[PDB]
């Protein structure tokens, strides 16, 4: 059950399949051939041809075109939208209009220009708040940008002019000031198109169980092609031949479309199962791979963080009393809107509780975060209570002649090596102490990974964050390994590492840097805290936003393979038993003494085929409730799970065509159509 | 007779297990490259002389040795049958073959099958009979065992890349198994009165006024070769019912033991090399169940026999038209299943003149793929492709991965077994399709009605499945049949051996693993009921319309 806006939007994709692009589905393409040239006979039959009964061969043609239109309806619902690759990540580049300066000096004539004309070596201006239109280097100015597109961090990073730290990247967002940059590379070679074209066209690998019964899709038809299409040289010698309208239809009845529709029938079944675990899935392939994943990858930022990157126990200091120090921490966080300032306000209500200070009753000039000094601050007293990083204030400490003690750097020797992001607060020119902001993890996280390793699954944590930050959290998450400070191209080369080994990989991340690693992954799990680009690139989306909840995904995927093998024993013994239902009834035109093989008292060779195609049409339909309403599993051994599967569904596979043909042949008799 | 029918099979299987038990112990030395305890350095005299350095071979190098042997093994024989007149020991002055009949038999003798579409004592001349046939069945039998040895070695080895040495295999198999065991049987035939000499054709002054010329020749030496190596091409045209080849009923029961002397002992050698004996003792078990059923049908289908005989005023309805009174009715019934389940090609009773049910079952057991105690080599790897299918669908219908004899089996190791099993029922619905369209193949029939369709179908089903059993009412001396079968016998053999060496190539670099929840116990008759329900199934899916237009239409009419 799905909303009809999702459903009706897929039938347009169905009717576009019907030209020569269904040749990759090998069973249903042969069904398309017979359905094509049963209409070629029947239209020529009504115009002029040797056979006479056109209403017979019309209903021969009819249900087959129902079947192809159904089996592609089932598959396009089940397959996807699995390579709905890059829209929102692409749509930024189409909306990448940018102002540019007509002269290289700052204070030039400006004009907003769309991204087409921004060729290599163009004087372009980036004011604050906007994004970066193209790659290159900064030639004039100094500002702080956020590089969440290329690193996946919400931490602002410096970006100056005239230095090593000037190589801007097109796609990231600027925060503080203006920058005059110039495009160093051609269009199409920009990092967005280095990422768009790497996400799009990145091909999923089929699971080996999916590959397996596609051979028995073909290893039965090559049998059934020969045993039908050689009757006409085997009967024409023996008196009368068998007509083409039979033999084309006799070819198509026997073809195992029951196992043809099984790929979608396990697809939409687990698709209905994942919604119960608060997980939107978009691929039927992605459900079944969850019962096979041995290595699953994580981003520590966004998923293991909560977008916070912020904490402290309290503020360490070197011989400075914490009271006016931590009150200045409140003062160094009044004007700020980012949660990094807001957690310090939450730190202010931890111990000293002197919160009762209004914004404008203190009457202070709110110093914003600069880029020359690279610090924010506030001026309530005569002193300048400035907040900033370590090394930016090390300019300001030497700017006023004094020297801070090395134990403040020994705090950094503890803060960074705990895996925290340090902050220093200075009243006037006097250093107070070091504020340490570390990551916090979501919930009962180690107890999930303890279960997750004991389900025989490795755990590797990947980021572009620092090693010394990630190594502590890797100890605080129970993960196996960790690779830090990694480009998004290195994530694919890690997935191509583990998919060289023949192993199925489950990426889980948030950022657009993870959108490459969400492409070639198998169970690609997005996050609702993540961007709308990674949700598009992700093959599967959580609704409750917990990256550790692949455990519920595996316990559903392992239910699916237990139900997948049950549906095979039905369907692999359905179409074998279908073969005994139709072949002896298709002989009475050739030898009249072969009437004794009409076991099920069928009316004519023409009668059994009409019941067969309608049986071959209901059975692709009825798999989806047989995958859902009526569903079974129970954990067993290797042996008796087959023994339990042959009694229930295997013995059921024999009866259903012998039951179903005897039913439909009587409805073609009691109503008596032909 | 029902007790005599029960005793005939039960005597036959019991003595078969006693004889094949130490022979399976013998061949297990040859699989492990362990020389036989009789001759060890005596071999090493010969491999110095031949330059066969005992160097290990991967499958690409191994397969081009056997195929290089068989093509070279044909090029001598294709030159002998042309220039037969220029060769010694000809008692008559018999000319060489026409080039179509040259080509057909030159394929036929290399290819373990021996489709004779002629009469040997009228046409062959004791030297292409001797040095073109008896030297060739000893190759084609060993060419089969060289394959199945490279298959068993692909299972018991762990992460290697080699499959023994090809030329060391063939010399051990011929000169220590195929030659001396056939030597003991060939002496046994003469004790009961077979024929083995180099005399010219002795005439007979009969007791009536007429005369008859008798044929002679080195027959009893040849006769023990083909029955051991499942080769079937006898000297005469009555190529096992002729008295010079099978003079007593006691020579029959040794011949029936000879057809399963090798391809049962290979199953015992299969269980011994792979550690657990039960892997063979199910594989043996899964062929007898098809065997014991398919004999007892034919024994019942001959006790019924023709009802028209007793209608015309005879004694009973027991069919003795296409049989031999020297042998039994049940004994002609047993042999006809034996000689057609086992890819042999010998004939004690002209299969064209059975009943309709009695002709369907030998036509059935070829079309199955020649698995049910099949040909020397070609039965057992013909089985092991179906074993790699019934394991494959089992893991496909549990959910987990297929794993047989400890090794995982991947997609590349499964596309090939889907290919090779789709060859021998591809050609018999292409060869039989090609003959029944044209006026060349339809002209060579003998009988009208649906049974005459079987005479076309039984020929190609004894061509792509490499049997050599003939209805022989089919006058197959035309150049159409002689080019049809020679294409159907070449592809139906070397389109199986080549994907086996690709299967046996790929299982070597893998490594066995531990037991799990995906590893089925591939022994035990709770799995044999999956194998026989697959081995009979692929033959059922491909031939029920091919057979209901044949002898079943004869049976009802």
């Amino acid at each position: 059950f799905e909303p009809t806006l999702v459903v009706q939007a897929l039938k347009e994709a169905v009717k576009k399949l019907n030209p020569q692009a269904q040749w990759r589905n090998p069973v249903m393409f042969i069904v398309w051939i017979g359905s094509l040239l049963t209409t070629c006979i029947s239209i020529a039959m009504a115009s002029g041809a040797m056979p006479g009964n056109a209403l017979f061969s019309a209903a021969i043609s009819g249900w087959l075109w129902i079947t192809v239109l159904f089996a592609n309806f089932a598959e396009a619902l089940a397959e996807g939208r699995s390579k709905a690759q890059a829209n929102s990540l692409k749509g930024v580049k189409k909306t990448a209009f940018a102002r540019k300066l007509r002269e290289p000096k700052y204070g030039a004539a400006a004009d907003k220009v769309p991204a087409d004309q921004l060729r290599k070596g163009d004087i372009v201006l980036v004011e604050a708040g906007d994004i970066i239109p193209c790659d290159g280097e900064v030639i004039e100015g100094g500002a702080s940008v956020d590089e969440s597109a290329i690193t996946g961090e919400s931490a602002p990073v410096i970006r100056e002019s005239g230095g090593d730290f000037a190589s801007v990247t097109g796609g990231t967002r600027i925060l503080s000031d203006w920058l005059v940059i110039e495009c160093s590379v051609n269009p199409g070679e920009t990092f967005l198109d280095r990422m768009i074209a790497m996400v799009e066209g990145a091909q999923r690998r089929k699971t080996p169980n999916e590959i397996a019964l596609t051979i028995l899709l073909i290893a039965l038809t090559i049998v059934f092609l020969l045993a039908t299409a050689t009757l006409w040289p085997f009967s024409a010698w023996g008196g009368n031949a068998v007509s083409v309208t039979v033999l084309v239809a006799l070819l198509v009845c026997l073809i195992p479309t029951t196992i043809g529709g099984l790929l979608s029938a396990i697809g939409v079944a687990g698709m209905s199962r994942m919604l119960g675990a608060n997980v939107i899935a978009t691929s039927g392939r992605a459900v079944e791979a969850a019962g096979d994943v041995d290595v699953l990858l994580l981003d520590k930022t966004g998923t293991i963080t909560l977008g916070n990157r912020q904490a402290s126990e309290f503020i360490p200091a070197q011989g400075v009393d914490e009271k006016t120090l931590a009150d200045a921490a409140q003062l160094a966080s009044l004007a700020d809107e980012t949660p990094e300032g807001r957690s310090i306000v939450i730190l202010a209500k931890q111990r000293f509780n002197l919160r009762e200070r209004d914004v404008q009753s203190l009457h202070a000039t709110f110093v914003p975060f600069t880029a020359q000094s690279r610090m924010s601050g506030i001026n309530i007293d005569n002193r300048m209570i400035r907040k900033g990083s370590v090394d930016a204030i090390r300019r300001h400490v030497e700017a006023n002649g004094g020297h801070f003690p090395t134990d403040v750097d020994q705090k950094v020797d503890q803060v960074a090596r705990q895996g925290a992001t340090p902050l220093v607060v200075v009243e006037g020119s006097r250093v107070l102490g070091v504020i340490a902001l570390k990551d916090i993890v979501k919930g009962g996280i180690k107890e999930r990974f303890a279960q997750l390793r004991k389900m025989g699954i490795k755990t590797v944590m990947i980021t572009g964050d620092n090693r010394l930050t990630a190594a502590a959290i890797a100890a605080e998450a129970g993960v196996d390994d960790f690779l830090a400070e990694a480009t998004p191209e290195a994530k694919l080369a890690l997935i191509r590492q583990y998919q060289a080994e023949g192993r199925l990989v489950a990426m889980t991340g948030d950022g657009t840097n993870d959108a490459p690693a969400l492409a070639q992954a198998d169970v690609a799990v997005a996050m609702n805290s993540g961007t709308q680009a990674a949700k598009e690139a992700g093959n599967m989306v959580d609704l409750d936003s917990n990256p550790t909840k692949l455990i519920e995904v595996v316990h559903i995927g392992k239910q699916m393979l237990m139900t997948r093998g049950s549906l095979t024993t039905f369907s692999i013994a359905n179409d074998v038993a279908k073969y005994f239902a139709i072949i002896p009834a298709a002989f009475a035109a050739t030898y009249p003494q072969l009437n004794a093989l009409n076991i099920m008292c069928l009316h004519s060779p023409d009668s059994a085929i009409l019941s067969a195609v309608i049986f071959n049409a209901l059975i692709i339909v009825f798999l989806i409730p047989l995958a859902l309403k009526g569903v079974s599993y129970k954990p067993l051994t290797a042996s008796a799970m087959l023994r339990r599967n042959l009694w229930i569904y295997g013995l059921g596979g024999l009866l259903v065509p012998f039951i179903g043909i005897k039913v439909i042949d009587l409805l073609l008799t009691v109503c008596g159509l032909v | 007779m029902a007790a005599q029918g029960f005793l005939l099979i039960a005597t036959f299987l019991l003595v078969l297990m006693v004889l094949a038990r130490p022979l399976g112990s013998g061949l297990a030395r040859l699989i492990n490259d362990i020389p036989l305890p009789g001759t060890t350095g005596v071999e090493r005299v010969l491999f110095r002389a031949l330059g066969v350095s005992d160097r290990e071979m991967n499958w690409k190098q191994y397969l081009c040795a056997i195929l290089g042997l068989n093509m070279l093994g044909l090029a001598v024989l294709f030159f002998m049958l042309l220039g037969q007149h220029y060769l010694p020991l000809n008692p008559q002055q018999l000319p060489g073959l026409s080039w179509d009949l040259a080509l057909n038999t030159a394929v036929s003798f290399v290819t373990n099958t021996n489709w004779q579409s002629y009469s040997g004592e009228t046409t062959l001349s004791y030297f292409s009979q001797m040095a073109g046939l008896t030297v060739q069945n000893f190759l084609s039998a060993a060419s089969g065992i060289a394959v199945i040895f490279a298959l068993i070695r692909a299972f018991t080895r762990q992460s290697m890349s080699t499959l023994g040495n090809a030329w060391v295999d063939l010399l051990r198999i011929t000169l220590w198994v195929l030659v001396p065991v056939a030597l003991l049987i060939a002496l046994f035939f003469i004790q009961q009165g077979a024929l083995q000499n180099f005399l010219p054709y002795q005439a007979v002054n009969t007791v009536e006024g007429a005369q008859q010329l008798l044929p002679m020749g080195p027959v009893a030496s040849q006769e023990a070769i083909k029955m051991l190596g499942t080769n079937g091409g006898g000297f005469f045209n009555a190529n096992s019912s002729h008295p010079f080849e099978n003079p007593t009923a006691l020579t029959n029961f040794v011949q029936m033991l000879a057809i399963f002397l090798i391809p049962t002992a290979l199953c015992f050698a299969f269980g011994e090399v792979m550690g657990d004996r039960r892997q063979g003792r199910m594989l043996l078990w899964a062929m007898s169940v098809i065997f014991v059923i398919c004999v007892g049908v034919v024994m019942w289908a001959e006790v019924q026999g023709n009802p028209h005989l007793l209608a015309l005023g005879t004694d009973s309805s027991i069919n003795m038209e296409g049989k031999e009174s020297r042998f039994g009715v049940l004994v002609s019934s047993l042999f006809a299943v034996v000689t057609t389940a086992a890819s042999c090609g010998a004939v004690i009773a002209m299969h064209d003149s059975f009943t309709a049910l009695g002709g369907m079952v030998p036509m059935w057991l070829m079309q199955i793929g020649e698995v049910v105690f099949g040909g020397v080599g070609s039965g057992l790897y013909g089985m092991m492709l179906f074993v790699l299918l019934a394991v494959f669908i089992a893991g496909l219908m549990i959910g987990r991965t297929p794993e047989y004899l400890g090794k995982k089996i991947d997609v590349r190791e499964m596309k090939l077994t889907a290919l090779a099993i789709l060859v021998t029922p591809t050609l018999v619905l292409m060869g039989a399709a090609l003959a029944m369209m044209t006026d060349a193949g339809r002209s060579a029939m003998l009988n009208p009605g649906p049974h005459g369709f079987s005479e076309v179908l039984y020929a190609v089903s004894s061509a792509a499945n490499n049997n050599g059993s003939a209805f022989a009412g089919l006058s197959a001396n035309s150049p159409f049949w002689n080019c049809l079968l020679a294409f159907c016998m070449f592809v139906g053999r070397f389109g199986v051996i080549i994907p086996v060496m690709a299967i046996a190539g790929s299982l070597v670099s893998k490594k066995s693993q531990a037991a799990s929840s995906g590893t089925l116990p591939t022994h035990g008759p709770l799995f044999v009921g999956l194998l026989i329900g697959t081995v009979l199934l692929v033959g059922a899916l491909t031939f029920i319309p091919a057979l209901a237009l044949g002898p079943v239409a004869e049976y009802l009419s």
Binding site: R24, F29, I30, I222 | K415
Partner: peptide, 27 residues
């Protein structure tokens, strides 16, 4: 020997030319 005779044979050869090509590959 007609288009209602031999052109059906060419079609069935093409399906084996298709199905086997579908069986060689995991397309």
């Amino acid at each position: 020997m007609s288009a209602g005779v031999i052109t059906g044979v060419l079609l069935v050869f093409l399906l084996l030319g298709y199905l086997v090509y579908a069986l060689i590959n995991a397309e």
